[PDB]
Amino acid sequence: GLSSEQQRAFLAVTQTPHPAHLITGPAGTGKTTLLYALQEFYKGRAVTLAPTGTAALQARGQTVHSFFRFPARLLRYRHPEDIRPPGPHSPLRKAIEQMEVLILDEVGMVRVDLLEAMDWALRKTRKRLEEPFGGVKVLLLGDTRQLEPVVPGGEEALYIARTWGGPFFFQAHVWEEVALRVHRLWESQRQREDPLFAELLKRLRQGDPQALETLNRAAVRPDGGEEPGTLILTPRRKEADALNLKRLEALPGKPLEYQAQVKGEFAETDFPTEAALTLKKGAQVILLRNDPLGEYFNGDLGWVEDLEAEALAVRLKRNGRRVVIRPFVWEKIVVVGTFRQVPVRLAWALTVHKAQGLTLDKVHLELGRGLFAHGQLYVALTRVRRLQDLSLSRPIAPTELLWRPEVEVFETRIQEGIWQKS
DNA sequence: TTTTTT
Ligand SMILES: Nc1ncnc2c1ncn2[C@@H]1O[C@H](COP(=O)(O)OP(=O)(O)O)[C@@H](O)[C@H]1O
Ligand code: ALF
Numbered sequence: 250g251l252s253s254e255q256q257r258a259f260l261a262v263t264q265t266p267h268p269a270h271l272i273t274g275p276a277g278t279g280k281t282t283l284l285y286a287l288q289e290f291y292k293g294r295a296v297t298l299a300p301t302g303t304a305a306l307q308a309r310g311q312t313v314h315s316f317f318r319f320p321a322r323l324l325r326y327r328h329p330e331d332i333r334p335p336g337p338h339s340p341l342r343k344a345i346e347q348m349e350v351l352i353l354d355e356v357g358m359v360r361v362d363l364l365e366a367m368d369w370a371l372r373k374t375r376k377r378l379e380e381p382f383g384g385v386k387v388l389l390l391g392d393t394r395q396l397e398p399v400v401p402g403g404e405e406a407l408y409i410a411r412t413w414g415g416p417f418f419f420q421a422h423v424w425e426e427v428a429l430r431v432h433r434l435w436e437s438q439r440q441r442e443d444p445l446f447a448e449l450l451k452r453l454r455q456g457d458p459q460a461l462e463t464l465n466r467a468a469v470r471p472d473g474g475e476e477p478g479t480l481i482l483t484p485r486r487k488e489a490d491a492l493n494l495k496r497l498e499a500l501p502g503k504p505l506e507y508q509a510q511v512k513g514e515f516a517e518t519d520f521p522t523e524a525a526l527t528l529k530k531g532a533q534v535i536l537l538r539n540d541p542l543g544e545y546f547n548g549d550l551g552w553v554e555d556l557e558a559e560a561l562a563v564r565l566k567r568n569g570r571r572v573v574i575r576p577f578v579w580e581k582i583v584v585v586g587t588f589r590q591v592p593v594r595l596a597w598a599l600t601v602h603k604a605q606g607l608t609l610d611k612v613h614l615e616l617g618r619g620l621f622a623h624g625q626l627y628v629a630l631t632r633v634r635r636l637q638d639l640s641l642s643r644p645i646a647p648t649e650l651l652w653r654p655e656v657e658v659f660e661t662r663i664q665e666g667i668w669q670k671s
Numbered sequence: 672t673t674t675t676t677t
């Protein structure tokens with residue numbers, strides 16, 4: 250069962266009427282495991298969300314965007330074009346009106362506009378414009394030393410800097426109206442059988458330069474990616490694409506190319522997957538959409554066992570079952586354009602963003618062009634249970650590590666067990 | 672740079 254610190258956080262959150270809680274702690278402390286106990290306690294009263302397909306599946310929930318039907322773009326502060334309440338007799342309206350608890354996992358990855366849009370979407374649907382989250386009890390779980398929210402450099406960064414001052418969930422204006430009670434987990438459950446590896450991760454989290462050189466001497470193994478049962482992580486999509494292409498090319502099976510059908514407007518680069526996707530029998534893949542029948546999920550890893558122009562059979566890693574995947578129609582709505590493609594991507598290599606929240610048997614980090622996101626390295630290192638399960642393509646220099654002053658201000662302030670934005 | 676999608 251639950252550890253004594255998970256049990257203490259479980260009781261602190263469930264026994265009080267206080268409507269805003271944050272359960273935070275280092276990687277693998279058992280936050281999502283506590284989230285499963287919270288789901289058994291609240292059952293139907295709670296909706297569980299997470300910012301990524303991976304984190305949502307790990308949390309036995311849904312992405313924030315698929316639940317609220319938010320567009321995959323910047324969500325302007327309380328903007329009616331971006332934040333639309335559901336229809337008068339829709340299944341989403343009923344779900345929002347009846348909800349008592351919102352469980353939000355991997356909150357560190359939740360961008361400020363996404364959290365603010367959740368607040369406003371709840372207040373509008375529930376017709377409670379003066380109550381944060383429309384009276385919904387909010388249980389946030391995550392870690393600000395793991396991946397920072399994704400901020401494209403142009404007009405999105407400007408808008409965020411002008412509206413919130415920064416992109417972090419804790420910079421949301423909702424926190425001026427409600428105090429966030431903070432509960433902590435400290436004990437590594439993922440690395441519990443390797444205590445020196447748990448301590449090395451702790452020193453790396455604290456930016457210790459000696460722990461980095463120790464990590465480099467022990468874990469640098471350029472051939473680490475070629476070993477069976479290893480998942481490769483890369484900072485970039487184009488880096489993962491090159492490593493996936495090489496594995497696909499080595500497979501003996503006849504290739505089959507899947508040309509996406511693009512109709513109407515539908516802008517390039519967005520595009521939820523590649524327009525000309527090549528697959529073979531034996532290819533390692535990741536599923537990009539939840540089955541409307543509930544047999545597979547966005548984030549499911551698997552292997553292609555059969556393939557044809559309009560269908561493929563995928564053996565799932567999660568349950569050892571075969572599922573039949575047909576092309577999916579992504580519709581750009583203002584229904585200006587469509588993008589029809591099989592909702593699959595190659596997955597011998599994935600971005601570090603797609604691994605956050607997972608416990609992996611074996612990981613190899615391919616540095617490529619380098620680290621660009623705060624918490625990116627830390628996420629890659631902390632996916633495994635033991636040091637021997639981790640390998641790096643090259644040594645990492647101390648100059649590659651990132652500092653986020655806004656994260657440090659938040660982390661210092663929550664030491665008091667509360668977050669109250671001025 | 673990366674995420675969300677429809
Ligand atoms: N109380 C516990 N007892 C045993 N194993 C646990 C416990 N809590 C977590 N774990 C395991 O440790 C790993 C990391 O837990 P997880 O909840 O995913 O951590 P986090 O969400 O904090 O990163 C998982 O393999 C999980 O099953
Ligand atoms: F904090 Al985690 F997997 F959710 F390390």
Ligand SMILES: [Mg+2]
Nearest residue numbers: 280281282606
């Ligand atoms: Mg987790």
